[PDB]
Design an enzyme around this catalytic site. Structure first.
Site, mmCIF file in Angstrom:
data_model
loop_
_atom_site.group_PDB
_atom_site.id
_atom_site.type_symbol
_atom_site.label_atom_id
_atom_site.label_comp_id
_atom_site.label_asym_id
_atom_site.label_seq_id
_atom_site.Cartn_x
_atom_site.Cartn_y
_atom_site.Cartn_z
ATOM 1 N N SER A 158 0.701 -1.211 -0.032
ATOM 2 C CA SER A 158 -0.096 0.010 0.015
ATOM 3 C C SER A 158 0.921 1.247 -0.101
ATOM 4 O O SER A 158 1.978 1.109 0.518
ATOM 5 C CB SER A 158 -0.919 -0.083 1.176
ATOM 6 O OG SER A 158 -1.727 -1.042 1.122
ATOM 7 N N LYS A 174 -9.135 -2.005 12.424
ATOM 8 C CA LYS A 174 -9.247 -0.770 11.989
ATOM 9 C C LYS A 174 -10.231 -0.838 11.170
ATOM 10 O O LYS A 174 -11.149 0.306 11.086
ATOM 11 C CB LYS A 174 -8.340 0.004 11.361
ATOM 12 C CG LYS A 174 -8.535 1.482 10.900
ATOM 13 C CD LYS A 174 -7.175 2.296 11.339
ATOM 14 C CE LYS A 174 -6.908 3.315 10.394
ATOM 15 N NZ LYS A 174 -6.807 3.168 8.978
ATOM 16 N N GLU A 212 -29.090 7.242 -12.002
ATOM 17 C CA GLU A 212 -28.697 7.017 -10.738
ATOM 18 C C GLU A 212 -27.605 8.084 -10.400
ATOM 19 O O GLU A 212 -27.066 8.575 -11.082
ATOM 20 C CB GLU A 212 -27.949 5.534 -10.488
ATOM 21 C CG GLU A 212 -28.864 4.382 -11.145
ATOM 22 C CD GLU A 212 -29.709 3.849 -9.986
ATOM 23 O OE1 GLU A 212 -30.753 4.537 -9.260
ATOM 24 O OE2 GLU A 212 -29.466 2.869 -9.090
HETATM 25 C C1 HEM Z 1 -14.491 -3.776 -6.215
HETATM 26 C C2 HEM Z 1 -13.643 -2.578 -6.267
HETATM 27 C C3 HEM Z 1 -12.526 -2.494 -5.381
HETATM 28 C C4 HEM Z 1 -12.132 -3.131 -4.291
HETATM 29 C C5 HEM Z 1 -13.045 -4.141 -3.409
HETATM 30 C C6 HEM Z 1 -11.063 -2.553 -3.824
HETATM 31 C C7 HEM Z 1 -10.087 -2.993 -2.790
HETATM 32 C C8 HEM Z 1 -9.064 -2.564 -2.533
HETATM 33 C C9 HEM Z 1 -8.179 -2.604 -1.234
HETATM 34 C C10 HEM Z 1 -8.587 -3.738 -0.310
HETATM 35 C C11 HEM Z 1 -7.133 -2.227 -1.614
HETATM 36 C C12 HEM Z 1 -5.867 -2.112 -0.383
HETATM 37 C C13 HEM Z 1 -6.475 -1.375 0.881
HETATM 38 C C14 HEM Z 1 -6.605 -0.078 0.617
HETATM 39 O O1 HEM Z 1 -5.721 0.845 0.121
HETATM 40 O O2 HEM Z 1 -7.839 0.548 0.634
HETATM 41 C C15 HEM Z 1 -6.961 -1.376 -2.574
HETATM 42 C C16 HEM Z 1 -6.108 -0.639 -3.063
HETATM 43 C C17 HEM Z 1 -6.011 0.096 -4.045
HETATM 44 N N1 HEM Z 1 -7.082 0.188 -5.102
HETATM 45 FE FE1 HEM Z 1 -8.662 -0.663 -4.840
HETATM 46 N N2 HEM Z 1 -10.729 -1.680 -4.822
HETATM 47 C C18 HEM Z 1 -11.584 -1.326 -5.651
HETATM 48 C C19 HEM Z 1 -11.635 -0.667 -6.805
HETATM 49 C C20 HEM Z 1 -10.668 0.168 -6.940
HETATM 50 C C21 HEM Z 1 -10.699 1.165 -8.286
HETATM 51 C C22 HEM Z 1 -11.846 1.446 -9.079
HETATM 52 C C23 HEM Z 1 -9.327 1.694 -8.139
HETATM 53 C C24 HEM Z 1 -8.897 2.470 -9.000
HETATM 54 C C25 HEM Z 1 -9.647 3.180 -9.958
HETATM 55 C C26 HEM Z 1 -8.820 0.916 -7.232
HETATM 56 C C27 HEM Z 1 -7.106 1.508 -6.929
HETATM 57 C C28 HEM Z 1 -6.502 0.888 -6.153
HETATM 58 C C29 HEM Z 1 -5.377 1.360 -5.709
HETATM 59 C C30 HEM Z 1 -4.256 2.136 -6.833
HETATM 60 C C31 HEM Z 1 -4.824 0.836 -4.775
HETATM 61 C C32 HEM Z 1 -3.634 0.882 -4.074
HETATM 62 C C33 HEM Z 1 -3.757 2.252 -3.319
HETATM 63 C C34 HEM Z 1 -2.789 2.263 -1.914
HETATM 64 O O3 HEM Z 1 -2.773 1.422 -0.960
HETATM 65 O O4 HEM Z 1 -2.115 3.231 -2.003
HETATM 66 N N3 HEM Z 1 -9.476 0.146 -6.448
HETATM 67 N N4 HEM Z 1 -8.322 -1.742 -3.238
HETATM 68 C C1 HEM Z 2 -21.551 -5.345 -7.627
HETATM 69 C C2 HEM Z 2 -22.400 -6.228 -7.584
HETATM 70 C C3 HEM Z 2 -23.664 -5.763 -7.784
HETATM 71 C C4 HEM Z 2 -24.150 -4.430 -8.204
HETATM 72 C C5 HEM Z 2 -23.309 -3.443 -8.011
HETATM 73 C C6 HEM Z 2 -25.547 -4.693 -8.068
HETATM 74 C C7 HEM Z 2 -26.425 -3.623 -8.459
HETATM 75 C C8 HEM Z 2 -27.712 -3.884 -8.688
HETATM 76 C C9 HEM Z 2 -28.484 -2.864 -8.729
HETATM 77 C C10 HEM Z 2 -28.316 -1.334 -8.829
HETATM 78 C C11 HEM Z 2 -29.938 -3.107 -8.939
HETATM 79 C C12 HEM Z 2 -30.781 -2.405 -9.122
HETATM 80 C C13 HEM Z 2 -31.554 -2.786 -7.836
HETATM 81 C C14 HEM Z 2 -33.013 -1.964 -7.663
HETATM 82 O O1 HEM Z 2 -33.145 -0.720 -7.998
HETATM 83 O O2 HEM Z 2 -33.971 -2.932 -7.471
HETATM 84 C C15 HEM Z 2 -29.719 -4.791 -8.743
HETATM 85 C C16 HEM Z 2 -30.554 -5.512 -9.055
HETATM 86 C C17 HEM Z 2 -30.411 -7.054 -9.146
HETATM 87 N N1 HEM Z 2 -29.009 -7.478 -8.883
HETATM 88 FE FE1 HEM Z 2 -27.819 -6.821 -8.551
HETATM 89 N N2 HEM Z 2 -25.730 -5.899 -8.258
HETATM 90 C C18 HEM Z 2 -24.629 -6.701 -7.999
HETATM 91 C C19 HEM Z 2 -24.440 -7.879 -7.849
HETATM 92 C C20 HEM Z 2 -25.457 -8.785 -7.977
HETATM 93 C C21 HEM Z 2 -25.312 -10.079 -8.068
HETATM 94 C C22 HEM Z 2 -24.204 -11.192 -7.657
HETATM 95 C C23 HEM Z 2 -26.473 -10.961 -8.255
HETATM 96 C C24 HEM Z 2 -26.519 -12.334 -8.451
HETATM 97 C C25 HEM Z 2 -27.620 -12.635 -8.979
HETATM 98 C C26 HEM Z 2 -27.557 -9.650 -8.586
HETATM 99 C C27 HEM Z 2 -28.704 -9.996 -8.673
HETATM 100 C C28 HEM Z 2 -29.556 -8.961 -8.834
HETATM 101 C C29 HEM Z 2 -31.003 -8.943 -9.061
HETATM 102 C C30 HEM Z 2 -31.512 -10.350 -9.271
HETATM 103 C C31 HEM Z 2 -31.620 -7.791 -9.408
HETATM 104 C C32 HEM Z 2 -33.124 -7.407 -9.631
HETATM 105 C C33 HEM Z 2 -33.880 -7.770 -8.437
HETATM 106 C C34 HEM Z 2 -34.049 -6.278 -8.182
HETATM 107 O O3 HEM Z 2 -33.998 -5.154 -8.607
HETATM 108 O O4 HEM Z 2 -33.718 -6.174 -6.912
HETATM 109 N N3 HEM Z 2 -26.722 -8.680 -8.418
HETATM 110 N N4 HEM Z 2 -28.267 -4.882 -8.489
#
Ligand code: HEM
Ligand code: HEM
Ligand SMILES: CCCCCCCCCCCCCCCCCC(=O)OC[C@H](COP(=O)([O-])OCC(O)COP(=O)([O-])OC[C@@H](COC(=O)CCCCCCCCCCCCCCCCC)OC(=O)CCCCCCCCCCCCCCCCC)OC(=O)CCCCCCCCCCCCCCCCC
Ligand SMILES: CCCCCCCCCCCCCCCCCC(=O)OC[C@H](COP(=O)([O-])OCC[N+](C)(C)C)OC(=O)CCCCCCCCCCCCCCCCC
Ligand SMILES: CCCCCCCCCCCCCCCCCC(=O)OC[C@H](COP(=O)([O-])OCC[N+](C)(C)C)OC(=O)CCCCCCCCCCCCCCCCC
Ligand SMILES: CCCCCCCCCCCCCCCCCCCC(=O)O[C@H](COC(=O)CCCCCCCCCCCCCC)COP(=O)(O)OCCN
Ligand SMILES: CCCCCCCCCCCCCCCCCCCC(=O)O[C@H](COC(=O)CCCCCCCCCCCCCC)COP(=O)(O)OCCN
Ligand code: HEC
Ligand code: HEC
Ligand code: HEM
Ligand code: HEM
Ligand SMILES: CCCCCC[C@H]1C(=O)O[C@H](C)[C@H](NC(=O)c2cccc(NC=O)c2O)C(=O)O[C@@H](C)[C@@H]1OC(=O)CC(C)C
Ligand SMILES: O=C1C(O)=C([C@H]2CC[C@@H](c3ccc(Cl)cc3)CC2)C(=O)c2ccccc21
Lengths: 383, 85, 54, 244, 383, 244
Positions: free
Chosen positions: A206, A228, A272
């Site tokens: 990190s 933390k 959204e």
């Molecule tokens: C599903 C979405 C994501 C998850 C679950 C995730 C998770 C993490 C985790 C656990 C770390 C290490 C701990 C921390 O620094 O907070 C991390 C570091 C980082 N993430 Fe993400 N991340 C996600 C999306 C992103 C996105 C969209 C970006 C960049 C556009 C990003 C860029 C980074 C970078 C550059 C680091 C290194 C930062 C540092 O520790 O200085 N991640 N991320």
């Molecule tokens: C990043 C992970 C996910 C995001 C960001 C996401 C986001 C969303 C969002 C914005 C909606 C619209 C909800 C609403 O306004 O009702 C939705 C609906 C739904 N998502 Fe996800 N989703 C995720 C993962 C999943 C996964 C893994 C499943 C597995 C099937 C799932 C199943 C559904 C279903 C069945 C609906 C429609 C029913 C509903 O609107 O509640 N989603 N999701």
């Protein structure tokens, strides 16, 4: 030698969640990574659960969501939790990208996790959107129409791709069923990429809020950051609880409780809250292709931060001018968000264009210039 | 660029003695009142301008734009709206 | 006080058993306590309060 | 947009259910059902509500069975495969006034009266919008408004011209609990009832949220104690440097 | 240093598919691992594609599968490919487990990949089964009834669990929608476990057909085994093509083209060819709970091979007596398969019981005894 | 089981479509449709086949449009929301003789004539079973067989007693191509038609499989050359050992 180190499988877990050496001074903005992990886990749990109750057929989709709300035990909770966590996911991911931009996490040696991150950000947008469409309310159907028509921008083949993605001449049943398939799939792809950007980060470790090396002073991930990260887990769940239980519809659009009618689009089209910044960008540009390019470029342009930041110093803790520029950039991104939800009227049309230019000029002009000047100010200023 | 425990990749350290006490031996909330008031004021004051300047500017810009927009869609703003379109 | 530590906390088996038995007691009493509290703050509002008319 | 095109934004009324710990007033829900049944059901369906949903909310099991049993619903075909009707049961949905959209429009000078099961969630304002709309028909449209034919002026509806005429008048319903059925009283009751229709889990949801807020608050407090406790060796760490 | 070694992400790929040091003498039975990977990729591609067209609601499910066959372009191919690859997946996985049992791949130091493998085998059974149910033909509905009632074996709570799994009092719409959710999910879980058992194997490396160390003579995974795995890819696709295009219904049960009717169970109940061995085990045991235990134990008992094989020598290449015992064990497993599909009549009831006893006695009696005796024969025989 | 309980297994007839490279005989499909339409459609539905499915298989677009246009199907309600019928179109499904299962059973002494769209895939034997069944009603049941009331003896049907009577007799259909309409000819034609109904992709499927078999064979041959080529250094490796 400790089992956790000996055994190959445990050793991989160990290296990520237990012995992982972290800088000792990460502040609360380093907690978004684990909140995004928690959001991703909540979304998978509630999502898979909704998938057990939801019917992808267009004749039944909206009704199956009402059935979830009304008939399924705790269906209301699962549905609102899923919908609200999608909003929290974006708060956390903008926070996390914010943190990374402010502290120069995108600079070497972390360009790879940054660049993989930019793809996670695009996948989240597509996942969350594909999920929005599954409700098949009014906004859902219209959102589908627009996103599937962004490929019409692509010349010649464009129109045919649109029809291919709809599986029809319009958004209809085919589209809704393929969005369901992909919305279920996309989160697992997103979890792969989330894992990959951590694996890419594990080479450098990190960053920290000072932007100096932490090799001099490391702390085990557990117990320090485990405990933390619980503080923010509980703070997140407090905010989650306030939305999910007390105001589940605050973050939603009323129009999505109207079933999809392909004959009208609501007079008040507002996507959204998290897509609003890019939507304002798309509105700003008066060209079809232009508008689409700009909107995608607003995300892809993050990929060039590693190049255009010319600073010899990592991150903004110590750069007063860069911090001010970053403040204006962030506030402009919020202004774009706001302009995304006003009516397309004077004077906000011109304002939205100015904010769009400012957004891009941060990456293309201001950051390169300011970072160059501050390099010089550090050197001259300390002689 | 970062190693692991034992070979973290710190330049060689010498001459730093680090001391700490047990979590059980320390009051975790010692001087919390002082910190919560005086330390947070210090840290807030030092960062205030970095938040206040862009927020106040973009709130002004939004305020001006929203007031103009409101005014354009009144009866008084008929003429200025006709010019804008 | 040493005694209390020795019995319920020293062995992790005992501590976890105590935490889960406390969670059981808390869960049952919290449910009952909130039920009564919820009925008092929404008195005369809920179906149970007007049900007697029918 | 102009004010007209937006609609006037409804006043924020102090509903019984506003407030983190507040349920619906079930007596009001029951009264509101009676308004729906005797006024709105002529034109508006409530398709997502089943008789069983009223049970233990507004009506006893027996009263709701009585409501269901008064109606005929499509049964499974008889043994010769001829269609049959049966008396309604609690699992049946409250039936609409119209067989389809076209019949609905035909009866309403082209306008389609929406299903009301979701209307409290489907409009900005929710209960307040329904109450404002039902009570907000002025005796005379503001001078200068030209209504399209078969439209009625109502400032709360966007555009001003709504295809629904004023329908609540003092004493169109005779409440079974002796409450004075004034336009405002009926609008408040029916607005409450419709809000329940849109969100029937409301009462349970807020109660579980209360329990969650309490538990999560305590856990957040403790988690902070535990974090500070575990981190205290690092925070309290002191260095002595002797340059070599 | 080569990029493929320098870059953390590439280095993980490199370590698995390119530089991975393999023994130089792996024979064609080492190819099933990659065929199972190919099956898993085919299943994901065709599966996600069917999910774009399939409707999980019981009123529509069977019809949506007919719509896939009839109306969707190439739907027939995608459907039959998905169905047939599920059969090939089991041929390959039995082949792969066969290979592992014959060559003592379960012995130290590979007990972990073996044991993770046993879980992959259970997950495959549950995945392919949940997938069978989604057609909602006659065999599908009955299959669902039977499997969810295996929990009825569990006393007391057991019966309540059954109802909870069905989401009803019988298999119906709720059940089908939840099987759809889990059938989509289960393969991704299975790909995780497949990956994990490789990571566990990467500590010891592949075994080889001699059962000696290969540390003396290693060969890079590519080009040698990449090109070797293509031969079986094309041989597999030839067999796939013959089923998919020429006889797509040879491996199927006609009764699954009858829509589910909960009032009648087909007089000729016979599950998928791959479940037949364990189905015969279940039929053999007369007790309810006995039958279920035995059937599950027939898979879980593989977990004890690491203990009960007492050989000082790894695998069967050099053990004539063990090879004969293994031949009889395999043929008995095929006999169980056959007895799974005859009518429950004399004399096959007694025969099925004898085969069931022989199946278990291989792990509990014969293998421990034979392996002990052959140890002694090697030592005495070579003196 | 007893032979009776299983049914006699049908003979394997040499259908035109048996054989890896063989299509259906489309002339036979057309004739078989005419048998379905004039005999079987009285009792059996073909619900999964639309008129468009016949087009370019058995009938031209025009002939199938003529078949659709002869029927009335449910249209969208008119402007007053009254139900309407329209003439059929190619996307419409061939309609069944009965409105529901119960009406089907009523007309068939309790037995339900199955939908035939899938029957060739839904029975062991497929085409052969349909042909064997339709042609396999003996003039007299084997001595000693007691048929249940309203059952007919047919050895191919499991149990022997089928609720469907013999229906094909010489000249019940008059073929439009002048083919002698014998029981066997009509059974072969209708069996072929039904087999097409069950698997309409059959012709395309086998053609693509032919192309696939050829490509995959060539790739398998080449892949073996390439494997042997790349492995030859390892296979050809020789060792000289000098113990140190
Ligand atoms: C599903 C979405 C994501 C998850 C679950 C995730 C998770 C993490 C985790 C656990 C770390 C290490 C701990 C921390 O620094 O907070 C991390 C570091 C980082 N993430 Fe993400 N991340 C996600 C999306 C992103 C996105 C969209 C970006 C960049 C556009 C990003 C860029 C980074 C970078 C550059 C680091 C290194 C930062 C540092 O520790 O200085 N991640 N991320
Ligand atoms: C990043 C992970 C996910 C995001 C960001 C996401 C986001 C969303 C969002 C914005 C909606 C619209 C909800 C609403 O306004 O009702 C939705 C609906 C739904 N998502 Fe996800 N989703 C995720 C993962 C999943 C996964 C893994 C499943 C597995 C099937 C799932 C199943 C559904 C279903 C069945 C609906 C429609 C029913 C509903 O609107 O509640 N989603 N999701
Ligand atoms: C969403 C889901 C809910 C979960 C909650 C997670 C949020 C936690 C987080 O990251 O922010 C807390 C975070 C506390 O984190 P910290 O680790 O104590 O210090 C992080 C800063 O780098 C330390 O910054 P500093 O030491 O310069 O302190 C600055 C801060 C004072 O910091 C405080 O703690 C207050 O004051 C301000 O900047 C406020 C501006 C003046 C307003 C007039 O609050 C801030 O400092 C927010 C400032 C953002 C502007
Ligand atoms: C809103 C306006 C943002 C201005 C921020 C300027 C810095 C500041 O004062 O913040 C406090 C602190 C200052 O912390 P710091 O680490 O610079 O300083 C700590 C104290 N010293 C300097 C002594 C070491 O900054 C942060 O923690 C900023 C994190 C950025 C998160 C941005 C989220 C926005 C989402 C948009 C995504 C695209
Ligand atoms: C069917 C009967 C199986 C008997 C096999 C006995 C060994 C034999 O002759 O095979 C040839 C070969 C013999 O190979 P080998 O490696 O022992 O010998 C090579 C030559 N020498 C000894 C000189 C080094 O065996 C295999 O390759 C066996 C692989 C087993 C796969 C079993 C699949 C069954 C699925 C059931 C799952 C539960
Ligand atoms: C998945 C989504 C995660 C978000 C959790 C928030 C609350 C969800 C629970 C429902 C709820 O409101 O519970 C209340 C109590 O609050 C509580 O006590 C729950 C708040 C606790 C939050 C954190 C604890 C664990 C969260 C996830 C851990 C996963 C492990 C196993 C699931 C009501 O109580 P009741 O009467 O409904 O309760 C039944 C037994 N009395
Ligand atoms: C996913 C399922 C995998 C199984 C593939 C086997 C055959 C499927 C191909 C479809 C098919 O029928 O193709 C035929 C030819 O087969 C063939 O020649 C295809 C066999 C080739 C074997 C595998 C080679 C690569 C395939 C996978 C790579 C995909 C991603 C890379 C970009 C004839 O169809 P047609 O010739 O009429 O088609 C129009 C172009 N004239
Ligand atoms: C005889 C007709 C009629 C009666 C009685 C009637 N409505 Fe309506 N209602 C309509 C029509 C028509 C519209 C559609 C108006 C339009 O969209 O222009 C409508 C619209 C509404 C709307 C939503 C307007 C919107 O925002 O789209 C609500 C809420 C509503 N009605 C509630 C009620 C309630 C509550 C009652 C009685 C308690 C009621 N209505 C009685 C015909 C009726
Ligand atoms: C007037 C009645 C009637 C006519 C005409 C009729 N069927 Fe049937 N068919 C039935 C009934 C009833 C059954 C159900 C028999 C049973 O299940 O006992 C049936 C069963 C079948 C079955 C499947 C039997 C099974 O295995 O379940 C096929 C195939 C079949 N019919 C095809 C045809 C064909 C082909 C024609 C004419 C070309 C035809 N039927 C004409 C009434 C008829
Ligand atoms: C999705 C299913 C599976 C896939 C894709 C898979 C894949 C592989 C691959 C690629 C290898 C290395 C190359 C090879 O030896 O063939 C392998 C080895 C192995 N697999 Fe599997 N496998 C699967 C299921 C199983 C099962 C069910 C078992 C055990 C019950 C198993 C046990 C092993 C063992 C023990 C090895 C080490 C064998 C050795 O090389 O000596 N696998 N597997
Ligand atoms: C190991 C991976 C898989 C196996 C072993 C498997 C197995 C099966 C089987 C046996 C069926 C019954 C097919 C039939 O007879 O029609 C089936 C159906 C189905 N599978 Fe899968 N499947 C797998 C992966 C997937 C995945 C990843 C999806 C993604 C959704 C999926 C979606 C479906 C769907 C939608 C059906 C029902 C439509 C149909 O029957 O064709 N499958 N699967
Ligand atoms: C791409 C980065 C992720 C790494 C995993 C990708 C795959 C991977 O490791 O490939 C290798 C080629 C591996 N075979 C071998 O080890 C191998 C070793 C020795 C001999 C032979 N053959 C002999 O003649 C072999 O074939 C294989 O087939 O395993 C798949 C299962 C893997 O997929 C996964 O686990 C993920 C998921 C698709 C199952
Ligand atoms: O007009 C739009 C619109 O433009 C978006 C937009 C905003 C965000 C866009 C986007 C932002 C970033 C990326 Cl990387 C890709 C797409 C996607 C399309 C919507 O989501 C929308 C939803 C409902 C009705 C209309 C609309």
């Amino acid at each position: 030698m400790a089992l956790r180190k000996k055994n190959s499988l445990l050793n991989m877990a160990n290296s990520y969640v237990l012995d992982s050496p972290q800088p000792s001074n990460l502040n609360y903005f380093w907690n978004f990574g684990s909140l995004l992990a928690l959001c991703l886990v909540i979304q998978l749990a509630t999502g898979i659960t909704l998938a057990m109750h939801y019917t992808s057929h267009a004749s039944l989709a909206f009704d199956s969501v009402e059935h979830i709300m009304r008939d399924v035990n705790f269906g209301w909770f699962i549905r609102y939790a899923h919908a609200n966590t999608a909003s929290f996911f974006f708060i956390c991911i903008y926070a996390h990208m914010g943190r990374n931009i402010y502290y120069g996490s995108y600079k070497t040696p972390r360009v790879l996790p940054w660049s993989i991150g930019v793809i996670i950000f695009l996948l989240l947008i597509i996942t969350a959107f594909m999920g929005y469409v599954l409700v098949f309310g009014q906004m859902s159907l219209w959102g589908a129409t627009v996103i599937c028509n962004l490929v019409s921008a692509i010349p010649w083949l464009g129109e045919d791709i649109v029809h291919f993605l709809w599986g029809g001449f319009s958004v209809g049943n085919p589209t809704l069923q393929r969005f369901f398939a992909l919305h279920y799939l996309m989160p697992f792809v997103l979890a792969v990429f989330a894992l990959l950007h951590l694996i890419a980060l594990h080479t450098a470790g990190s960053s920290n809020p000072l932007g100096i090396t932490s090799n001099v002073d490391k702390l085990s991930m557990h117990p320090y950051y485990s405990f933390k990260d619980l503080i923010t887990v509980f703070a997140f769940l407090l905010m989650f609880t306030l939305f999910v239980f007390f105001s589940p519809d605050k973050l939603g659009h009323p129009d999505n409780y109207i079933p999809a009618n392909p004959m009208v689009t609501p007079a008040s089209i507002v996507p959204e809250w998290y897509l609003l910044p890019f939507y304002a960008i798309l509105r700003a540009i008066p060209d079809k292709l232009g508008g689409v390019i700009a909107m995608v470029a607003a995300i892809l342009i993050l990929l060039i931060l590693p190049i255009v930041d010319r600073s010899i110093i990592r991150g903004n803790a110590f750069k007063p001018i860069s911090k001010l520029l970053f403040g204006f950039f962030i506030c402009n991104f919020l202004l774009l968000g706001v302009l995304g939800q006003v009516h397309i009227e004077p004077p906000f049309i011109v304002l939205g264009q100015i904010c769009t230019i400012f957004y891009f000029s941060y990456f293309l002009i201001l950051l390169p210039m300011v970072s160059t000047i501050e390099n010089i100010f550090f050197y001259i200023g300390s002689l | 660029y970062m190693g692991w425990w034992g070979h973290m990749g710190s330049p060689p350290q010498k001459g730093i003695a680090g001391y700490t006490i047990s979590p059980f031996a320390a009051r975790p909330f010692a001087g919390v009142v002082h910190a919560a008031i005086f330390n947070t004021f210090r840290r807030t004051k030092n960062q205030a301008l970095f938040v206040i300047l862009p927020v106040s500017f973009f709130y002004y810009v939004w305020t001006q734009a929203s007031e103009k927009n409101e005014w354009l869609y009144t009866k008084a703003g008929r003429h200025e709206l006709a010019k804008a379109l | 006080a040493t005694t209390f530590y020795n019995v319920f906390v020293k062995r992790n088996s005992a501590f976890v058993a105590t935490i889960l038995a406390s969670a059981f007691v808390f869960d049952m009493t919290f449910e009952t306590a909130i039920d009564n509290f919820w009925d008092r703050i929404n008195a005369g509002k809920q179906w149970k309060d007007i049900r007697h008319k029918y | 947009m102009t004010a007209a095109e937006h609609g006037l934004h409804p006043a924020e009324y102090p509903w019984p259910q506003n407030g983190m710990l507040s349920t619906f007033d079930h007596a009001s829900l029951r009264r509101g059902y009676q308004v729906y049944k005797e006024v709105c059901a002529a034109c508006h369906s409530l398709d997502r509500i089943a008789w069983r949903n009223l049970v233990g909310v507004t009506h006893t099991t027996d009263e709701a069975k009585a409501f269901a049993e008064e109606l005929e619903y499509d049964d499974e075909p008889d043994d010769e495969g001829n269609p049959r009707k049966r008396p309604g049961k609690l699992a049946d949905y409250i039936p609409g006034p119209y067989p389809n959209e076209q019949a609905a429009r035909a009866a309403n000078q082209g306008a389609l009266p929406p299903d009301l099961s979701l209307i409290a969630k489907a409009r900005h304002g929710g209960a307040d919008y329904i109450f404002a709309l039902l009570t907000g028909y002025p005796d005379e449209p503001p001078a200068g408004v030209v209504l399209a034919p078969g439209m009625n002026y109502n400032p709360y509806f966007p555009g001003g011209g709504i295809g629904m005429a004023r329908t609540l008048f003092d004493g169109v319903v005779e409440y079974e609990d002796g409450t004075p059925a004034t336009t405002s009283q009926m609008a408040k009751d029916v607005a409450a009832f419709l809000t329940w229709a849109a969100e029937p889990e409301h009462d349970e949801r807020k109660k579980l949220g209360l329990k969650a807020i309490i538990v999560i608050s305590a856990m957040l407090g403790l988690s902070v104690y535990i974090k500070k406790f575990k981190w205290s060796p690092i925070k309290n760490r002191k260095f002595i440097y002797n340059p070599p």
